[PDB]
Design a protein around this ligand. Structure first.
Ligand SMILES: CCCCCCCCCCCCCCCCCC(=O)O[C@@H](COC(=O)CCCCCCCCCCCCCCC)COP(=O)(O)OC[C@H](O)CO
Ligand SMILES: CCCCCCCCCCCCCCCCCC(=O)O[C@@H](COC(=O)CCCCCCCCCCCCCCC)COP(=O)(O)OC[C@H](O)CO
Ligand SMILES: CCCCCCCCCCCCCCCCCC(=O)O[C@@H](COC(=O)CCCCCCCCCCCCCCC)COP(=O)(O)OC[C@H](O)CO
Ligand SMILES: CCCCCCCCCCCCO[C@@H]1O[C@H](CO)[C@@H](O[C@H]2O[C@H](CO)[C@@H](O)[C@H](O)[C@H]2O)[C@H](O)[C@H]1O
Lengths: 500, 496, 497
């Protein structure tokens, strides 16, 4: 039960500096994030865009190559979980607060405003651009990290860490040396800022959903939502035990409430129009896939840079930062799975759920816009969902259910991430200290709250700007994780049985 | 060997008492078809569009998988036909009447009017859209149904029926039970209306051809009756005379006459422009494939719904209703082949023939539009081919040949389909009774004539409306045929 | 190996006839080239466009098939060049002069004027259209011709000749008869005119560079003669002297000066914008690949014919002319490599260089257009690189390096191609006589000069018209080489490789 204090102190110190900086110096912190956002988006936006699509190609090649047959674990090892059970668990890997936050807003803004290189009121571009940010690019990054940890821990028996995946390139001297520790420090920092963004989005949307109950104010979002969801629920469940019996119950509530919320909009909404957006979004996603993969700051005659920072480069930075958690989560539930089957399940099942989600919620909002009724309202992204729900019969009750669903994603997402952060701080130990897991949840919630407070009126922008800067160092870890992964697969397994 | 009357009577009652009484109540029939068409297109257009493209993906994955090495028959068994006879045998089946009917109009109307999401006068979109409805989506449906029948009756030795292909899902108890009969009844009803649509188009075009040749005035309802009555009688005489040499004489004449017509327009039309369209049709088809596959009733800002019901959803329903006949036809001529070579041949050979055919007739009509000439006339879809032909030297002679070519496709299509329905009503008997074969052909021509007579001015609209309604029940059989086929393929003798 | 006078003469008099016709009768030569260009583009433009993309599919389908594992050489053979070295030699047999000439002009032209079916000021279309003409279509032709030559020479032990690759179709007797001689004659003629075009572009740009550097008042007709005479003489000295140290030293300078030029523009130019165009050009290339593959004279409502004849049908003809040389060059350095390794290396490595090259020079030129500057100037295609350089600090000294780089490309392009021509006029001898190698290089320079002199104010247009006519016969040799390569490879799987 040793603690990697050399990995805790660096990653921890950076968090407190961000929390201290964003509270007493909101102006200075806001300026730096805006300034740093500009430097990263200009000088490295190509790197996010270029390597975003390299990940999709790289993981498809790996699945279709000889490496697909490799089995994550002992040869002829039965998977620990059934296929249907394994499929049902990836839903806990999904981004339930981002899907709820951007379920209506994203396809609606693309429809209302258009995207660079396209005109307004284009349904296919609206749905295809949303599927770009949510289906394959996010889950190619998670597959790469999940595959690297799965192979290292199961097929090679190495420590469950991000640095253990780099043993092929830097060996054990680097993995336990300065470079290995740096890779593990950047993984914790990325997870804190990747998770903090979702917690901040959820707190923002719950605050908008409470408009029916109370008027919104800074303290309502600041203390009430933040402290209540982080304290009464996250700490208590974690402190009581590693498996508090609440996270398993709440993980069920996330599945049940999400399905009921989708079914209510699907049934009570424009059912036929939603079913039209199923093949419409998949077809237009595949048609425009490379047209959006090649959209850079020089697209639209050079005017695409501002849009990309808000939408595409933010999502790429967000996915890159969530990779250490989602990679660890997918690795755990995929022992004994083949590489080809692991990639196919991870790539396609989450893509199918995101497609259906945005068709129901994105399609319903677009249908309203077409008919004249606009749920746009003022335009804030945190109240588009509750505008959509209030526009259907029974919306008041389901609007309350959406608030409860967000609350259970806040606790579930914090507990799932804090568990991985504890593993990285205990030399890859599967069962981590209750206090260590609690502390990482507090820090992540403190970061997500500080981003909201510092931003003020532009709370969402400060949330997005900080995530891009925090995910930049780990973009190069994922790139080097592709080279390490090929060396690992090519070195051990091939020579094991057939070649030698 | 005996007749399955539990399948004939349910199918005959729907064909006889329900539809063929569209001559007694035309106003009532048209309203139902219009109302039923709106219900299907609105509430189930997504299903046709979504699963039309899944068939293409599913069939490509089957060939690319380890299943492609399975032989359709006994292991290490050679194909019965040569790869040249086999490939030329695919030139039977086929639309034939649909290619002549829509050979000129479909690419021309898309050029004149455009398509949802695109502006008019786009040659790439006009030709890519035509290739969408005729090359891969139709022949992925046929390959699935043909592959399921070929696998069940050749490798596994089951009966040659649609229901026998569902034994993996429903078991032998189901295949002989209520569900097995329902699948066979739906297969017959789909084939009757899928073929009745082709016969209706063939009779409409022959009526337009006769007026264009000045033999008759504008064709009336009685003239259409004579065409269908005369052609069906010629079909009966061949069938009831026994095993006749006439049908193969007509099947060969279809190849020569169809090729003679395509060569004439190619050599006499804008050869260079037609040739330019061969890369243009194929390149733009692959460019827009998924853009067209993602076109739904709420594309073009909720404006593609009317267009889809007339053009895309009609074809998908038309192909799904054709699948039982073309599936059985492909199974017979593909014994001993591998799944990979069967799929690739079925997918690509018709894709190349359709691409070349529409380039000669779609391209020639579009070239006239650009130059200043125009074969649109009054906009009727049945008179465009003869407008194209009469616009070229020697057009009068070749216009007659087009009518002759349509007449032979009528008998060839009625007989080829009536043979499959006879097999479905005789527990999979290949050598079906000649009397049952003639009965199914008469009903098909009676249904086609009813759709034309009922529609009146909007004769085409009534053909397309009823076809979409008839094919909707069989859309879910083909969806289930994918699950049945995969289970069957997985549980092969080589591996369980 | 005795000289093949039955092949030299038919290919020589056609070369000699072009020189006399194009020098003493400039007016008649240009009229025939324009008339013949229209006939070829109108009646066979479909064939160039159809089969340009069939080559890409064919070569990809061969690498991914069971043939991908076949080794180019005796079984269990190892390549004599490391993968790093083998990749380095790929840069030789690249255009060099073509990249230098069209590095700035092509992407800038499409951005400013647009392409059929698209509007102006489209960076994605401008960059993808340039990638269409330089990345996969050219190198799918070179991989087909190089693979066919490599397989028949190493795996089968035939002669290092193009007609030897048709033995599966026309038998051993056929390769020695008229049909085999015809393929050899066409292969030489195609190489001479494909090489003359690159040399003609090189002398056209050098004359522009001299004027841009104020060394000379203007590039008169005699100025172009002086450039070609000086550079062709230097090529002769290297071949006659027998000292290969000179050429290998020049070949290294090409990589050093080319990389130096590219890095200078990358660093002093808009670096961030250049980096944006890397994913932007690759992504928009894969998006539009089939839209551009389907572009014919019937596109844009029947208005793309003139554009295609100038841009796409010229490049397809130009690559078909370069095929015999790049085919032999690739085969020589690709011994012991599997089919899959050869196809992947040949397709992807040169595609990577071209994407970077046009992003640096095309992207810099486009960025100047956006900001209000414009290196377009008079619109002359041979002065756009030097307009781009003089717009950057230190571009006057770097303008000289661009000219010296053009000259070294001129010397090595002539020597590299004439070596292949000498080989294929001496029964496939690996090292033919230096005198015969020098004779073919001089003949190549004479046509390049003749096309430039005959064209006059339309020198560039004359080069393209003649290149399209010369490559038309060879378009069918490459088409049939696909049917001969599959037949030859299949006989190996019977051998089981
Ligand atoms: C939740 C909403 C719906 C989601 C829908 C997605 C469903 C995905 C579920 C995937 C399950 C896990 C993946 C299982 C793959 C198995 C890998 C494997 O082992 O190879 C097999 C599978 O290989 C394949 O052929 C892959 C299937 C084709 C995949 C093509 C998918 C195309 C879809 C892309 C659409 C575009 C995506 C858009 C995203 C928005 C080969 O089978 P075999 O019979 O040889 O196996 C051996 C046998 O048992 C003897 O021992
Ligand atoms: C054919 C027009 C229909 C277009 C509509 C359908 C869209 C698909 C078009 C592209 C499909 C290519 C099919 C052939 C290649 C894949 C099949 C394979 O893997 O094995 C091939 C193995 O063959 C090879 O080794 C070479 C591969 C051929 C690669 C494709 C050829 C070109 C296809 C289209 C070119 C597009 C040109 C216009 C540009 C837009 C067998 O094909 P084949 O050689 O029998 O087909 C051609 C026949 O021989 C003609 O004589
Ligand atoms: C910035 C500096 C300026 C200059 C730029 C330099 C550009 C260099 C770019 C380098 C490109 C990499 C290509 C190198 C390939 C050499 C090795 C090779 O031939 O491929 C290997 C193999 O590599 C692979 O496996 C590649 C498989 C994936 C194919 C690549 C897919 C992406 C291609 C995208 C290109 C799209 C077109 C864009 C063109 C503009 C060989 O091994 P093998 O074929 O025996 O392996 C067998 C294996 O089972 C299957 O091949
Ligand atoms: C009007 C234009 C004409 C149409 C356009 C041209 C399209 C040509 C399509 C022909 C494709 C035929 O399909 C081709 O069949 C052969 C055998 O017959 C298959 O053959 C291959 O796979 C099968 C099974 O794995 C094996 O039996 C065989 O040994 C192997 O070579 C190919 O996998 C397939 O590519």
């Amino acid at each position: 039960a040793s603690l990697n204090w050399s990995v805790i102190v660096p990653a921890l110190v950076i968090v407190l500096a961000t929390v201290v900086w964003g509270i007493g110096f909101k102006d200075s912190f806001t300026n730096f994030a805006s300034s740093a956002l500009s430097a990263v988006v200009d000088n490295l936006g190509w790197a996010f865009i270029l390597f975003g699509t390299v990940f999709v190609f790289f993981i498809v090649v790996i699945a279709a190559s000889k490496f697909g047959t490799i089995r994550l674990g002992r040869i002829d090892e039965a998977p620990e979980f059934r296929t249907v059970s394994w499929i049902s668990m990836m839903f806990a890997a999904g981004e339930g607060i981002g899907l709820m936050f951007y379920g209506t807003t994203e396809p609606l803004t693309f429809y209302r405003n258009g995207v660079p290189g396209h005109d307004e009121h284009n349904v296919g571009v609206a749905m295809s651009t949303t599927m770009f940010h949510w289906t394959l690019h996010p889950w190619a990054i998670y597959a790469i990290v999940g595959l690297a940890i799965a192979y290292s821990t199961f097929r090679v028996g190495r420590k469950q860490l991000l640095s253990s995946a780099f043993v092929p390139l830097i060996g054990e001297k680097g993995a336990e040396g300065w470079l290995g520790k740096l890779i593990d420090i950047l993984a914790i920092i990325a997870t804190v800022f990747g998770t903090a963004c979702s917690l901040g989005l959820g707190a923002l949307q719950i605050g908008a959903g409470l408009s029916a109950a109370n008027i919104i104010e800074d303290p309502s979002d600041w203390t009430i939502v933040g402290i209540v969801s982080v304290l009464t629920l996250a700490f208590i469940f974690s402190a009581i035990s590693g498996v508090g019996k609440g996270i398993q119950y709440l993980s069920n509530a996330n599945m049940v409430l999400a399905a009921l919320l989708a079914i209510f909009v699907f049934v009570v909404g424009p059912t036929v129009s939603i079913l039209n957006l199923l093949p419409g979004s998949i077809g237009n996603y595949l048609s425009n896939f490379f047209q959006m993969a090649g959209r850079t700051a020089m697209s639209a005659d050079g005017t695409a840079g501002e849009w990309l920072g808000s939408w595409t480069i933010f999502y790429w930075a967000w996915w890159i930062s969530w990779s250490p958690f989602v990679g660890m989560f997918l690795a755990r539930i995929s022992r004994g799975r083949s590489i080809r089957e692991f990639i196919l399940g991870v790539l396609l099942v989450p893509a199918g759920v995101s497609t259906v989600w945005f068709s129901i919620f994105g399609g319903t909002a677009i249908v309203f816009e077409q008919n004249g009724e606009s749920i746009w309202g003022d335009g804030a992204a945190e109240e588009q969902l509750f505008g959509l729900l209030h526009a259907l019969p029974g919306g008041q009750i389901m609007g309350i259910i959406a608030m409860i669903l967000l609350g259970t994603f806040f606790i579930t997402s914090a507990d799932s991430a804090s568990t991985v952060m504890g593993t990285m701080s205990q030399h890859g130990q599967l069962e981590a200290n209750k206090w260590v897991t609690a502390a990482w949840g507090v820090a992540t919630a403190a970061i997500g709250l500080t981003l909201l407070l510092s931003g003020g009126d532009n709370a969402l922008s400060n949330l997005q700007n900080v995530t891009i800067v925090a995910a930049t160092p780990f973009l190069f870890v994922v790139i080097g994780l592709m080279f390490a992964l090929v060396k690992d697969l090519s070195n051990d397994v091939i020579y094991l049985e057939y070649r030698e």
